[PDB]
Amino acid sequence: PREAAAHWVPFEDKANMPDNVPDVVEVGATSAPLLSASYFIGAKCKPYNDDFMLCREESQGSGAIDCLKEGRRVTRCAVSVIEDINKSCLDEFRLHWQCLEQNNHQLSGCRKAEALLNKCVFTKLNLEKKIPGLRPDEEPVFLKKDPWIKPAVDDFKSVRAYAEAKKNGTL
Amino acid sequence: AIPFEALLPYGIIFGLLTAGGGAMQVLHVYRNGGVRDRFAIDQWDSQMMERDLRLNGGQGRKQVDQATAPEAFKHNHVWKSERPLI
Amino acid sequence: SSTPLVKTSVNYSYGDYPLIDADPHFKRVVGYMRPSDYGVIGLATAALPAGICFAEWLDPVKGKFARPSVKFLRVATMLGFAVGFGAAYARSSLRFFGVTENAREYKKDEAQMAARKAAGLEPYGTSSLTPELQEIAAKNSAHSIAGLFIFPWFNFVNHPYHGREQK
Amino acid sequence: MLILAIISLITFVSMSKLSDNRAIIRLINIYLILVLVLDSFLYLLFLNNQTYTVMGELLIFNSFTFYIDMLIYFIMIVISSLYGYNLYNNNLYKTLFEPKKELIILFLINILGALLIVHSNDFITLFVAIELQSYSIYLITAIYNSSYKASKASMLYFFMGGILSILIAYSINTYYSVLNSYTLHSLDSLIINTLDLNLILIALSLGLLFKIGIAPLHKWLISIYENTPILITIYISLIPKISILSYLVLSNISINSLVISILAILTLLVGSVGGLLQIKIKRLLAFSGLTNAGYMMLLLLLNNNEFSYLYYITQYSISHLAIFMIIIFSIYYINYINNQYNPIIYVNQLKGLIHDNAYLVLSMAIVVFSFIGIPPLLGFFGKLNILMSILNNGYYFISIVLIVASLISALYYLYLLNVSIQDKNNILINSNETVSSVLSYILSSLIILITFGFIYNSLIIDIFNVYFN
Amino acid sequence: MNTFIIFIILIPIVGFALLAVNILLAVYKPYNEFNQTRLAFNAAFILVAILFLPFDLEISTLLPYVMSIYLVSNYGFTIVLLFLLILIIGFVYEINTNALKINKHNKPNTDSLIYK
Amino acid sequence: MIINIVEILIFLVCVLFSVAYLTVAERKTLAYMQRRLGPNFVGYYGLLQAFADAVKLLLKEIVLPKESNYIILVISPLITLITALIGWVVIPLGPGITLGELNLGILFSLAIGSLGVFGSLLSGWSSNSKYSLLGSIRSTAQLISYELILTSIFIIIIMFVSSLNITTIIETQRVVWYCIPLLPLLLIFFIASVAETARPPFDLTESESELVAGYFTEYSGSPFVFFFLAEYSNIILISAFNGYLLLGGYLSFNYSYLFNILFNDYSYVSFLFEGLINSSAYAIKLVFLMFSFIWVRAAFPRFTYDNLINFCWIILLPLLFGIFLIIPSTLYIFDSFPTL
Amino acid sequence: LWARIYLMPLLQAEEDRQTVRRSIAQLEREKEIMKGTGFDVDKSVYNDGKFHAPALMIPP
Amino acid sequence: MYLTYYFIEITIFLAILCTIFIISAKNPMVSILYMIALFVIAAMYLYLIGLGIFSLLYIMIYIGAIAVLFLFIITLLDINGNDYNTIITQDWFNIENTTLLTTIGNVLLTNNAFILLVLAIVLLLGIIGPISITMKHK
Amino acid sequence: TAAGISLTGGRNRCFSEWQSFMHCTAKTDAKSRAQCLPNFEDYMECLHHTKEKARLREIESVLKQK
Amino acid sequence: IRAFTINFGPQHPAAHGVLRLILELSGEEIIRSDPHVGLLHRGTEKLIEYKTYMQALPYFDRLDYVSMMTNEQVFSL
Amino acid sequence: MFIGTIILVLSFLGFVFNRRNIILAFICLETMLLGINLILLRNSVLFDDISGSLFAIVIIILAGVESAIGLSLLVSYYRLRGV
Amino acid sequence: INANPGFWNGPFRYLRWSAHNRPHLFFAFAIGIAGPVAALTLTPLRRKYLYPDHSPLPQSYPLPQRAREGLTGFDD
Amino acid sequence: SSSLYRVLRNAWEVGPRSYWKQLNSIGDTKSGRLVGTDIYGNKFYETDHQDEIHLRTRYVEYKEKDYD
Amino acid sequence: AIIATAFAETVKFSGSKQELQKRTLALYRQFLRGAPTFADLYEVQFSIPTIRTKIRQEFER
């Protein structure tokens, strides 16, 4: 919760998870894939993560030491989601963060690559991006048409993929 | 038409800033290795990119997509030793 | 946008009379003041020019009994309205504290609260704020009629909690 | 309603000529009167010392501070009433005591600064307000610019004000360096047991106190209080006293202070003996101003002293205020006037005041009796109730050095009367002009308060018992 | 190692390479080659910089506001607008007192030819 | 370590090598503005002459007045020069391409311009003649007085941004520029822009007629190239500020429609061409602006100092507070509050 | 914003387990320095024994 | 990279060096010339401690106004064992870079807005005072 | 006020230790504050880590000894 | 007691002229001035008494050297 | 904690022993207002808040207005003299 | 000459008069007065006529108030 | 005038070797017709072209590098 | 040109030899008083009593 030093030195410890906690399948996803699939792991693993922050709340002082069962719980289901999308829409999902690896991860960059993915995951993995807190008669901003902030350079692959989504009638 | 001799040093400066911007594109992409720059360092993003260097192995922003972790991922993770601040 | 989520004293009186509110909203203070209160405003507005005419009748500036300029009278009228309004707000919002005579307004706030319960909206109305800002702005306006001698401060907030029974 | 006055009136002064300077101050006089009269009832805002914390743990409004909050308006009515009214309609009293353009602005800025100390819970509001009133007194000293002693005294006041600025700030910094608050709920008789917050709160106290004339830092305020003009000193020897002393008595941050007690002894001693061999009246008067703050240091030591403080405040801010106005009247009858900014200096100059009138003398005599505790006066019961608080908690040697201080004080207070009733050889028989009526009527009021103030001795005790507890 | 810290350090050395190049390249360095009483002023010289400090200072006072302006929705607006509306009348003190008027005593002698 | 030391050299020959031909370009302009030919004897089309200026100027001597502390006459040229040269970090050159990106851009951008007064005040104190001192006074008082409004519009710019990073502003500015909604802001900024530079619509203080042959110090040598180059660096530095926070910084149009026609994939050619066109939009705005400074330098006479202070505090700055009352209000009418 | 906060517990659980590993590892190492000489290693510096991060490490 | 460790202990000593030249100077202006360097060493210490914000705040206001103000006046004369590396974790609770400056703008405006409101009167006094003194109206 | 605020406006290092102290005070009158002392001491260890520094210099002395 | 009085131009203050010109400035306000002229003073009148009117004519286009022809004209007249 | 203490204390010792140069008193006071910062700012840093920074921005401002007011006091001190 | 009629003799005439003689004051002052007055009166209208506000942005992880139910899945 | 078209067309008329000499000699591009030469040896010209200002018509091409 | 320069006087012709003598005596006092100013102002090589012994002998002429 604090920025680093004048001259901080990094350090690590070659030790292990000692006795009781079994090993987990720890998320080996870099920022751009998990940022892309953030809505879907928030959609499927909603009450699990909600339980996580609830249990971290009620464990005042215990905190970190209490909910190890739950840190085991909430990561694994997200790993299940990303493995299912590794099997599901790996071309288009990868393409979404092939676009999103530029633009400083600004989500404003890759609308045309995004809407191709929204049909795909809702087809096979049958999940959906939903923005909570958005009261009705208010357009969700990745659903709207003619945005004000149009991005800098759309990638060359997903624009052709978008045209082919129109020609195949998948859109 | 126009006095070209007046615009000729302006043509120079218009070329000089252009060549500067071309080289300052090329060097930054060559540092990044294929992607553009990052025009906004967030604290969220700073911790995130530390995690990403920690994940990919060696390289800066290789940005890999993997199901699970490597075995060194449980061991590569570091803390920061801030000095005594006297 | 209506949960207080802070621990507020409930019906904690300030005198011998029952309260209504810990900070009455500024539109409400206009909406409940007695007709004898407006006389305090008017007599305060008359007091300042009569005060300057008095003060020169007592001891003139340059030895001659002369009435001052109309400029001084207009500005004294402005500050007389300032004193009268400060007195009006001050005399009015005590009755929400239950510290002076609370007879008609406790009846009227058994009416208008009940008038908007049946009307189905919020008992005080929605402010344009996140509730944490509603808390902090009401912490600013809490008891701020005290220290009216230093500075005027008011309640423009319309936050939820008011020292009511439950809501 | 201070800010509601200020924001209008500085627009008003900027849109005004130079001859309106009396009339603006007449306006502000009547204004503050009507602020007091029409809004007095806010003492009803409590019944059992019910204390409000306003603007979110920042200000503190209570049973206590409302009194000082009224008191400062009451004295400012008098100070303003000096300016706005002529003394006489003479050539002399218009090249003397003519206010500047910006002066009455700086007063309400200072009153904002004084009130935001006494009402302050936070140290940050404290620091802002002491900077505010320090800048106020910087200007109000330096505003009568074409006097060499005035500017020299402004610089002199400036650098000690800067030291106490940084010293109070260093105390707040150190208190923050050991604790993550700035308020004063964090004391609550539990951290005092288990943490050495003695020296830090002591260093807070000393930095707040040394803007008074506390006797290590002794000569410099006295040099100011003579190098100022005779008018400004009657304001600036009062407001920095009663502002911060009401703060320090409101929060008893140093209880059984070894430091403050020794400094109180040394304060009383050197003030009483410093009043002795002096013929300059502004000096003598400032050393009276010292020793009375000497008594204030005693009232800082105690626990739960809201009677003797407030009663001695309303004693002092009447008597000390009024004796100036008496010698402001007295300069008409004298035979030698120098120094347009500062007409009387030498106490010799009012040699024959009784053969001018008996009644300004009698009015001077009772107020100088009021500084020495003469029992039928209001000035007495201050010292009486101080001592009813002193031996309440066993400051025995403090009480006997109070007696030594009172006697050595009362030696030099009578020196005024030694001068004042003697032979003059050149007596007045007929003055043309009279003194401007309601200006002198204020002094008549302020002196019947002191004489006949033991009348309401009972009722003020009842108001004390009901309201302040 | 970052070029940001290299930038502010290299430029004084570039300035030294432009500084000592004259001492290297010049020659004939220095050959053989009343102010009794007065200095003159108006308040218009001395006052501009002294009055400049609160008006410079208020920008840095207003500067933490503009970063956080989304958080203080509809209320920090009200506070800062009260702050400004104090400072603006503080400004229009001086313009009615004409504090930066540096007026000339070249008056055309208003008073007429009153004679005999 | 290797690719950054070339990253700073290419920027140096992009800027320091350009600011000389700026001083050639001003002569070419004022030639055709006053119907005569520019420098033509010196180079091929009369280019390069700033080299012949400097190399001669590096060969003249270091004659020093006896009243001047010589160290002070070393410090003020050097620090004015390096002030106007370390103002060159977070100029943006395309998206996020600065010398060092840091999230507080404007604060550095503005504090170094705040340091810009500090050399010129210090400079006139050396050679302590009474005219030489009071000229430094008259210069520094306007040099702070419009440094106010220069500073003071930077906050109302970021009342649309609410972020101190400079390159964030342009990506905010993609939907619309800031000059085209806020037009009179540009006019008062343009006069405030030529104020903080020594420009003679406003620089009366370089009056050789008033002083005993004094412009600032007449201190010449390789000292003389220092304040001179600092002045012309200040010119296009404040042009750069005008470029990003008021005008289209590196933006021209959408140009994605063009790209998907041209390329099929990302490649170093694509980065090359996009960085070219972003730098060229920045260049064309910057190069019209440096011309506009001369275009107002020609057509107008100088001021009275009374005019100059009247021009600051009475006619410009209450209008600036009117901006401070209308733009939070326009922000308040709609929801419209910007987030980081 | 919603995208970041969905990811918040996912990273939180991992940094949790990094803390749980490295803390107890440091505690065991300080046990292994203070083996032999009797002294409390596993006693926490608090008065209410709760898990927390350690600070103030010995300079390497 | 062990030269990196003593950075802070550089600028402390360079501070101690500088202040001696404050209180030992022939001319008045030589002293403030050392003092502006003390401000710069201070700002580098603030950048090195980890507040890059206030480093540049001070350059805007200290060697921005008040130093240059001192220069401007002084022109106008007639004739001359805590060695423990603290451990820093990483938590993911923050969502947006509300930096130090944002939260100043929140606490000055919500929690303690009255301080800024009275600060308006302090800045008012800064206007009135020099016009209260240095003018001599009529 | 700026009571439990942080750099990023969240909660500081010892907010919990502060709030557990304030929970210690809100349920407790004077002449019974003595039981509040270990809640207070847990706060103080946050600020200056005096018990922690005393813990670490001893084990550092043992590590130096061998 | 007097102002810090200046020399306005030795060489190139006002173009086309050597304007040595004493100024006494009290607020950057001229209380009085005193221009010393004589810096171009060739003494031409002493010369023109020694030459014939025939020869004496180009003394005068030297005089007022921006409007030669009116000087020529006025002497011819 | 060393640097703010040492700047403050050396500024204090410079204020005491150097009266007769009067501007030196101002600038030692100004460095005192810097030294209180250099202690307080790192207390904000070490204590994970901006509450000390809240007091710090205010004392920056008050140091400023101090330099604004007292230097006009200086100009009043020298107008009535000559030197 | 355009000396003064006075604000307190005829207002609207004096407003016209200042607009003819000192627009530096009055057209800063008009932009200044148009700020808060429009800020007071227009904001009820926009919620009534144009469009209502936005949903508030969350500032942390939003915590609901529930009782930690039995949640199965991913034991091993 | 002095437009780009004129300098381009006269350079295209004269010839690039004489142009490369002339640009090192004068700054202009000038295309005359050899009215005559000098006994010292100096080739003169005269310009027909319509877009010429007054008294830009006739000019010298010298012989010596150290002309005057 | 209403006003004179600093030391310039209106020329006025003394009617008597004695009044002329009084003016000349005051004048030599003025030279003799301003003589150390001259060596500063005109930066001369030599000493002040040489200036004084010239100013004496010029009136001796």
UniProtKB/Swiss-Prot annotation, chain H:
Membrane-crossing segments per the record: 3-23, 32-52, 53-73, 113-133
Keywords, in A-Z order: Electron transport, Membrane, Mitochondrion, NAD, Respiratory chain, Translocase, Transmembrane, Transmembrane helix, Transport, Ubiquinone
EC number of the protein: 7.1.1.2
GO MF, any single term: NADH dehydrogenase (ubiquinone) activity
Gene Ontology annotations for the cellular component aspect, listed alphabetically: mitochondrial membrane
Membrane topology: Multi-pass membrane protein
Keyword Magnesium: no
Catalytic activity of the protein: a ubiquinone + NADH + 5 H(+)(in) = a ubiquinol + NAD(+) + 4 H(+)(out)
Primary site of residence: mitochondrion
Localization per record: Mitochondrion membrane
Protein's job: Core subunit of the mitochondrial membrane respiratory chain NADH dehydrogenase (Complex I) that is believed to belong to the minimal assembly required for catalysis. Complex I functions in the transfer of electrons from NADH to the respiratory chain. The immediate electron acceptor for the enzyme is believed to be ubiquinone.
Family as reported in the entry's similarity comment: Belongs to the complex I subunit 6 family.
Description of how the protein assembles with itself and partners: Complex I is composed of 37 different subunits.
Protein name as catalogued: NADH-ubiquinone oxidoreductase chain 6
Species: Yarrowia lipolytica (strain CLIB 122 / E 150)
Gene from which this protein is expressed: ND6
UniProtKB/Swiss-Prot annotation, chain K:
GO molecular function, one term: NADH dehydrogenase (ubiquinone) activity
Cited Pfam families: Oxidored_q2 (PF00420)
Reaction(s) this enzyme catalyzes, per UniProt: a ubiquinone + NADH + 5 H(+)(in) = a ubiquinol + NAD(+) + 4 H(+)(out)
GO cellular component: mitochondrial membrane; respiratory chain complex I
GO biological process: ATP synthesis coupled electron transport
Database matches in InterPro entries: NADH_UbQ_OxRdtase_chain4L/K, NUOK/Mnh_C1-like
Record membrane topology: Multi-pass membrane protein
Regions crossing the membrane: 21-41, 55-75
Family: Belongs to the complex I subunit 4L family.
Task of the protein: Core subunit of the mitochondrial membrane respiratory chain NADH dehydrogenase (Complex I) that is believed to belong to the minimal assembly required for catalysis. Complex I functions in the transfer of electrons from NADH to the respiratory chain. The immediate electron acceptor for the enzyme is believed to be ubiquinone.
Protein name as it appears in the record: NADH-ubiquinone oxidoreductase chain 4L
Organism: Yarrowia lipolytica (strain CLIB 122 / E 150) (Yeast)
